[PDB]
Amino acid sequence: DQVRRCLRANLLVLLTVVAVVAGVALGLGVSGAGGALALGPERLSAFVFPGELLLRLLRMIILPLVVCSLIGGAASLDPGALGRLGAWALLFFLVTTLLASALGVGLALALQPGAASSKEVLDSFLDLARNIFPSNLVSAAFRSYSTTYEERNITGTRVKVPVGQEVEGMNILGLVVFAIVFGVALRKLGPEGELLIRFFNSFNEATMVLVSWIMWYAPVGIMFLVAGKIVEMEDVGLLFARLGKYILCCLLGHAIHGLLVLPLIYFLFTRKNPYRFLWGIVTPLATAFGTSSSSATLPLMMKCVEENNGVAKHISRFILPIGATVNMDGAALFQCVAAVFIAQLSQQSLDFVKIITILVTATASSVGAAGIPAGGVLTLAIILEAVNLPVDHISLILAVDWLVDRSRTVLNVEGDALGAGLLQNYVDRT
Template identity: 45%
Template sequence: MSAKDVRYLTFPGELLMRILQMLVLPLIISSVIAGMSSVDKTAHGKIGLRAFSYYMVTTFIAAFTGIALAVLLQPGKSSRTASVSSSGNAEAVQIVDSFLDLIRNMIPSNLVEACFRKYKTVYSRSVTATSEKNDTVPIDDTVPGPGTSDGVNVLGLLVFSVAFGLILGIMENEAKPLRHFFDCLNKAIMQLVNIVIWYSPVGILFLLAGQIVKVTDIAEMGREVAMYAFTVTAGLLIHSLLTLPLIYFMVTRKNPFRFMLGLLQALTTAFGTASSSLTLPVTLYCMEENHNMDKRVTRFMLPIGATMNMDGVALYEAVAALFIAHINNMEFNLGQIIALSFVVTAASTGAAGIPQAGMAAMLIVLESAGLPTEDISLLMMVDWILDRLRTTTNVLGDCIGVSVVQHLSTHELQRSSPADQSLVEESSQF
């Protein structure tokens, strides 16, 4: 097929990508601010801070696990990929500048500009000199300077939204109107995302068709996608069967696998529904009836965890971003990988607990990393099973978080008054 025919073929998929890109900005702001403002430091004290810390630490570990596996196994990087050599000095300079760009983008000078432009160091031509033998000798391989590139500065918006949401949580009653506004905005955006998800199979079908007709070696692409699915599955198993049980054992000194056995009903429900929100009633039952967990902790942490604690999504997004980079022969340096880990951690925090909602969060990551968003169709070939596996990981992380926080907060729970208990149960209705 000609390039024009491929463009016509992928038009329904192009509409899907445009709709998702349209929702990225309000989705980032509303979901992150609504999620962060629910962490009420003064109302829940150490319990809330421990829950928030657990969510951030486990999500970052999951993202790091995904990045490490993707760098080690390199899914999507075929043997035909040509390697580009560069001098050690130039590479070192680019790593330092990428890390500094990461910090600059975390603190944008203009929030409006951050909606469509981000900071990126540009390099001028090499400075050279002539030696005594009339040879051209480089004095400085690269000369970095200020510059910008098109694209949403996702990292800057995420940092501002996290800080703004935490401040709203600290302000208590004074910030109620704003918290309700962002909560309502988040729910409205999620309704739009639900509508888009109904259309997404059609758009993805045409996007995938466009990718297939452009591929010269379908068998090679199939092997690369299979390697991607294997990498994600291996990462989820490591996080679920090694990282989370190790955290549980280190804190509680109890057998984590016996604890997981009591969650079997919730985990199977999560795998079947691919939705941590739909699994929430079963999760509450397993934690309160099978493990006798304090209702003040379960009804505070589990509803928030279904929105904020997305370990499986963070790991999947990290592997998927590097997979798409590999199939496009793009190499990430250390600074870009560090930036990717922060973006994945923050973007997964705002992912909705509904089937295939990770697609919208994945778009945020691809936009931030400067990767082609149309390649998301390749991920959808195996996403039906990976979505169920990462949802199961999310629910397991929520449950272990409840047990860890309750164990660390035993003294606070024993000293809490009935008024404190009603306050915690009331706030859990978020």
């Protein structure tokens, strides 16, 4: 038949959807009883197991991935050899990614989906800053910093005085700064650093096969993961509603971002109608919402932005190819919204500095996740394990990533499309 073509080509996505349709079914069948058929937590602790094995594979693969990939991505950057006219594009990409992430965490905090049913002082900024630059780069790979208070009982009966120590679970946040500074150092070293860069970049592809094989294992892990998850909550008529509120929340966040904020930076700078520009460029968005692929939509988008509202004719070949892989605004929006939704689902007591380190770490990792096909879930697990949040809920987000991803794709092309529709004045207005 023709079934062999559509089987082997798109196999892993069919495997994970046929795994998750049973994972909801098996968890439904054992959730018909109240979490205990014959062994309540005992057989459950082994019934939940291969999803936990999948997370065990994911943590040991997200250590070397982030350190070697950010070394290879911070040695590659050459701001001197990229043009000041191109540098303002990077500035715009960074500020709109920060803006998208900020508004997304703001709206997800405002609606607070999922929540429907350690006293640390303001001086956690010192703990976060000490966690940025760690004590040594081996204890930084498995344990981060944390200050607990004791009582010296001086000047009265009690005094809340902080002692400082290192608690378990790594700091990716404190490691990405060292790897980025290492890549910048390898650039500034120059020709002696060629061997180290050819080492570390080759180390990255020596782990892309590893995450490829973990992706091959991923269906049975995600099936057992979501099965143990829905037998844990014991509320299907509410978890459906929590997931739907989260989905609607992040899609309307995508909508209000792409419909007001990029229009805000348009009209605040160009003072021309953004709606006429978008009405000019409807059809590559009509294929981005068709295919959901930022790679294949790029030639039609580059051809369209030159015809309607004629751009500077070279940045369409310069900033628009490179902007598709660096300004993924909707993906950063999705990751910052979804991680706050898990914390509001598990009641993890968000400090404001936890909001800052879920902002900036997921912001800098927006430029990644492009070589990895399912990098949106991988980077989400990265920023979950950077704040010691439960990665256990990632199956539910990966259960419904398609329905929101169809809308997430168009933000990532709308951003750099409007950036192409913005910097044409900087040779005119200057």
